[PDB]
Symmetry: D2
Subunit: 423 residues, 4 copies
């Protein structure tokens, strides 16, 4: 794990950061009471001045207390003297816990969103750089028709922009806390305190909560994270295919190294991390069916999944940004790979042209097949066989024949497509 | 499976419905060409009049062809005579396949959305009916504080309304087809044909496609379906708990039956179907990383998951609607269950009241604990013990003591919460 | 789905086959009571002669009964006259259901196991056929060191022989039924009736059951099935890579076709079916935690998973067997692919030889790197560059150089490895 | 995570313990070469005396090397002087990595297995302690028929004894390393060195490896781990249900506490940890299909799963053992809960007795239903209503009636079932 904790994301998930979120919540709540005239003026400022985050103290108290937030509430109690009457007043532990996890997931979502937007900018730049670079399109791993390498990157760009909007909605979904007390009905803490306290944190009130924020929001967020990761996985698998020794179209950045031993190690790592990101979706979905007004089975799951899902995805986005930013792209090898089958890429164009000139689907098909076959089993090109085919010679001119091998045919609509992403 | 195929949803997924979607696509495409002046006037109308869906013919041709859409294209070919020149013109098979699955998933999404909205109306009605019905709030399966049964149903209502908006976005995500030919670059079919043909189907053009519509859209849709199902699972588990013999607060509708043998069979079934819905998420997510401009590994997955996920969820929503619509709710038993622990539900109120009147947290706590203990181990009530406690007798009046047992305390903010959902 | 239902597996999962298993269970149970003297002599043969599988009757009765096994018990009841006193006597529904599913899963396991052993025989045959066929070993998709193609097939053989054993244990695990009545404590049917009835069916008694056979047995079985599928998935991904245009070492069987358009469609299908097989594992694992002496949430999951997992794996085994049996293996291409990097595959042998002859690891490495580079960026071979390197010329003879390019170094232990599988 | 790392399991997964396993592998390999006469006598002891685990050195070298095992090989190299010629000789990195992970998973398996056997001993003890404790059996959460509480614990015992055996096979499955070099064909290190080196470590040779030990072995192991976890999850959900306020039959150990606020927090935790354990299964299964002779996508997954799955299960086994060892069992409450429905638990015996005495199934059923109804809606017992029923009065004696309410009918075979586990 520590392998991919990267700053800013990993600073979110220390024990200090967590206790500071709990204090933030507690201070928003005393502030809300005080602004409503419900506790004396001055309480919040004094608790702000005297409450310190002391991790060892809270952990020592927790040894005796066996309860994380009660230990915190007493630890803070021992620094704030008389003001402890007004601290954690009416709250249940999950008011603090779940509001603090909204804070963390919203912030993690924002870090993720900024790095994602940055991945989009790099993908847009790389797609425009190779906008007109010819490459062979491949279906079932088999040469199909010519295309451009910028258009392939644009498909990745297109997918990551759908993920920017998805990530914005997942941030919205998790932007809800609760300050509603034991079973969520404001018996011990007024709903006006909740509304003020959460607006100071940048959060909204869960419209109806139980003891807990409903876990379908978290499952939505984490399902969105797994889908972002699988798009990065699609990119990573492409580059693994393109860096294989028989292809050599692209090379992921590295580190003088042996030219024949450049392994796509980073993209293999990305593929494995995507497997982990989708692994967290299932446990988040059966966190949803909590018993009544809550059970705590989700808590242990979330200790793994919140920190690991958001730190792994962050590492995936930053790493894949660097891979696409700095990968070597071998344009001449791309172009050369179009001629690997020696013209047989243009074999549909040749087939149709024989139907145009009179022949029936089957008639044309047999002429192309025989030429294909000879091309495939030898060293001469498809075109050179077609030109010498007598049946072809009485139906098609030679200038007609040669123009069917123009790559620009496959390429006439690339700008049309790029233009859909402009402006 | 056939157990839960219900009309309208199951009519979507027959072989006839599929072939009709393929014809719909094909007709939108000839229409687009003809409206653009690219094929003669009259072609579409004549293909519309002569193309019949003949499932046995297509399947017989497929025996020879070994390819589903080629067999279809030839079957239709044999009915439409000369017009077959202009039919399926420039298309790749996945233009038809994936555009037809957008049609199916958008329509399935709309059927699902209407039944979901209807579930929301029933939940809103049931929540307002029991708005002020007292029930005991339960955390860790343990009596916590009083609450209202309408507020519990409102939490379900709140969750299903978040799922209506989620379902709308999932319908949007899947509203994209492609008419872009072999590797998605319009080499064989102009992008103006795509744009016209898909607007007649109510769909949008994938802004950049490969041979296929990118599979992250389908994974998003199906992840949303699994989250809707897990909310239905939360409801179903609640009712199972509430129909157990020691609780008897709610009874799912059934079918004169034995009163002691009413089993929550439907809600158990709902819980199992939610397990299947979340099971489809993982295969949809590794459908995303297709090789290059496509591989066909996703096709076999989607033969299971599109029809099964959308028919299971539809059955879940209709069944859970009926369960909530017609379930028996035992209000007097709910109210009686509040007094099961004989007043000990109000034990925090009693504790705080002793701190108010001078005592320290620990001092108060020991008085409540001893009374709790005596109450727990006997048949007299908490209140009756408190009244006779001397330490309590010198700190608290008896009218003070009795008012701490008012249920209306737990209940002062129920209308505030319901009002968040009005208007 | 129907796409891959293949005889004999799909005959297991009809409604008829299910009711036949129910009767088989019922007849074993009457036989057991009769042999113990608990019901009159002759009952079992009479019920055997009279009791007919009438699917439409049972479904008509179920319309009114709303209970599948009750409807069956009554339908059989209407055919067997006075002997209905002795039929289904003391049983709970899940005595019949779960015992019938053990029969099905055992027999499914056996059909799976015989096709698997047959897949092993084909793998052994193909591996021995290419025992000594040179091929380039590939790590990270990059040419590593020479090996044999039979050795690669052997690793697949070794994996499926581990699965044969795993399948035999999974059969063992599911060989347990129950005839123990409502909560599994033999209050209504004697344990000696259970023991006799299940030994007639070839099954063992769950040593302690509740109302149900414990679902960890089924989860273990389905987990083993998903493991077998992923080994098929490893094989199918190798053939996809090897059939790509730039590689052409292997070609899956098909159907005269275009030589350049041979797509690995069956293998991509096998990949997608492997994803469904692993998807069924999670739902099976959470069927395990049934509430108390049972809930029925697992029933609905098992209507999908039992038939779908066994039929999909059966399809995968039979199809992969035909793929490996009939695939074309291009040996000259495999041998030719070793020289793609023009000798650089032997570059570690060259490096070590320079350390042998005095040089330090870094010294040797720089000579190899420079020659590698020159080879990589040109058309001359590594050897030709080494021979002309003066630093190399004074440390190594030419005959010492050339013999580092012998493939038989890489193959000396092929024969030791096959030997481990013999006898 | 650190929450549940417990000695001895967490000592397995430090960086130090990992480098120690790497050295252990390296020393087995030098020992094997030396015993075969291939390197001078004395090398192994010298490398043993000199080779120190220096985590910070290896990490500093790795900063420059960017390769974990290379950095290790060099760091050891700087301590062992001239013997570095003989160290790591012919090995590929994954000879050390995968052999070291077999050591770890074997030893983890053994720690797991000893705590599991200990969980079985506690279960056997608790089951025998309540062998004859009457309790109500529950199906669909609804009172069914009386049984014994020891019988329920026996079913848990039976499940964990099946897991002991499953754990022994999973240990066997992962007992394979490799010392076969870059593509697993012993080109660079002899197979007799592998055989000797692995028998010193207690391991067997993968019969054919590629660059890596095949990942179906690890997926089988982790699948067995998730099965063991779900059986713990079945137990923990039972204790949650039994500790609910309306039931009070059992109370998990804790920490004087409030008697009404005893929450089943450990059991809810065990439930959530079971969800993480099953989440690791899917990522392990798709690690299986590595490309060719390996890709490294699995490495990153295994950095999470190996340590997390073995430590979480270890925590679950030890904690569930303490739960079952120390939980309070309320026998009088269990016995009292049988009479909750005031005799209606014996209603099938009454029904059958009326058919015995002449009546038809429907006739008998209506008498029982009417009395059931009256019992259900009042405070008088079923028996008292039956005795006063005139139709009952003319078919059944009072002593014939009362003895249908004997609990020993339900318990006669408890003793036969425990006997199956003896000896």
């Amino acid at each position: 794990v520590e392998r991919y904790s990267l700053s800013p994301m990993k600073d979110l998930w220390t024990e200090e950061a967590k206790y500071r979120r709990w204090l933030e919540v507690e201070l928003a709540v005393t502030r809300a009471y005080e602004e409503l005239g419900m506790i004396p003026k001055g309480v919040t400022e004094r608790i702000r001045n005297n409450a310190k985050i002391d991790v060892e103290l809270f952990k020592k108290i927790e040894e005796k207390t066996n309860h994380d937030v009660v230990a915190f509430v007493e630890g803070i109690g021992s620094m704030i003297g008389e003001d402890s009457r007004f601290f954690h007043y009416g709250l249940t532990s999950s008011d603090v816990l779940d509001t603090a996890n909204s804070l963390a997931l919203v912030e993690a979502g924002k870090i993720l969103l900024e790095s994602l937007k940055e991945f989009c900018d790099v993908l847009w730049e790389v797609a425009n750089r190779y906008k007109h670079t010819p490459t062979i399109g491949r279906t079932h791993g088999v040469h199909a028709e010519p295309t451009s390498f910028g258009l392939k990157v644009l498909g990745w760009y297109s997918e990551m922009k759908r993920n920017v909007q998805r990530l914005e909605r997942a941030i919205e979904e998790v932007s809800y806390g609760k300050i509603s007390g034991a079973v969520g009905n404001y018996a011990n803490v007024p709903p006006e305190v909740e509304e003020k306290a959460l607006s100071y944190l940048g959060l909204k009130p869960e419209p109806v909560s139980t003891q807990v924020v409903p876990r379908d929001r978290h499952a939505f967020y984490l399902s969105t994270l797994a889908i972002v990761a699988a798009g990065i996985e699609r990119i990573a698998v492409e580059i693994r295919h393109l860096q294989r020794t028989e292809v050599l179209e692209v090379e992921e950045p590295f580190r003088s190294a042996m030219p024949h031993k450049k392994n796509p190690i980073t993209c293999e790592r990305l593929t494995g991390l995507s497997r982990m990101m989708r692994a967290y979706v299932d446990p988040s979905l059966e966190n949803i069916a909590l018993w009544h007004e809550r059970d705590i089975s989700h808590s242990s799951v979330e200790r793994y999944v919140f920190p690991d899902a958001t730190q792994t995805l962050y590492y995936m986005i930053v790493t894949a940004t660097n891979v696409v930013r700095n990968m070597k792209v071998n344009e001449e090898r791309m172009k050369k790979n179009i001629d690997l089958t020696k013209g047989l890429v243009f074999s549909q164009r040749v087939l149709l042209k024989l139907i145009e000139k009179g022949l029936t689907r089957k008639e044309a098909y047999d002429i192309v097949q025989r030429n294909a076959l000879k091309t495939w089993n030898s060293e001469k090109h498809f075109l050179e066989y077609l030109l010498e085919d007598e049946e072809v010679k009485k139906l098609v001119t030679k200038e007609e024949l040669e123009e069917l091998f123009d790559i620009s045919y496959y390429l006439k609509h690339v700008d049309h497509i790029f233009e859909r992403f402009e402006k």
